[PDB]
């Protein structure tokens, strides 16, 4: 990283023409997702951390 184009790449957007819609496949959902949740706990009150 040169730290001079990294900042400029943050503020960029696409042409975004012709928005579409369709049904979602489980493979598509797993492609969207970054991880899987397993517990109902939201925030710990002993350290106040995720």
């Amino acid at each position: 990283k040169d730290l001079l184009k990294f900042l400029k790449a943050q503020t960029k957007t696409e042409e975004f023409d012709a928005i579409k819609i369709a049904l979602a496949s489980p493979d598509m959902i797993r492609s969207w997702s970054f991880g899987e949740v397993k517990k109902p706990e939201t925030i710990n009150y002993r350290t106040f951390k995720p």
Partner: protein, 50 residues
């Protein structure tokens, strides 16, 4: 968005997620213990409702 500060008490978007997560966890850990058909079907029905 905590109310009293001590407890955040997330509502109306995290209660449903918590219900689904905990019920799915119980059903998943009950499915591999060779649980009776009535119990497993009843748990699946509650998962569907959630």
């Amino acid at each position: 968005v905590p109310l009293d500060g001590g407890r955040f008490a997330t509502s109306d978007l995290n209660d449903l997620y918590r219900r689904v997560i905990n019920r799915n966890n119980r059903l998943k850990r009950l499915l591999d213990l060779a649980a009776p058909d009535i119990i497993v079907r009843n748990e699946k029905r509650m998962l569907q409702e959630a």
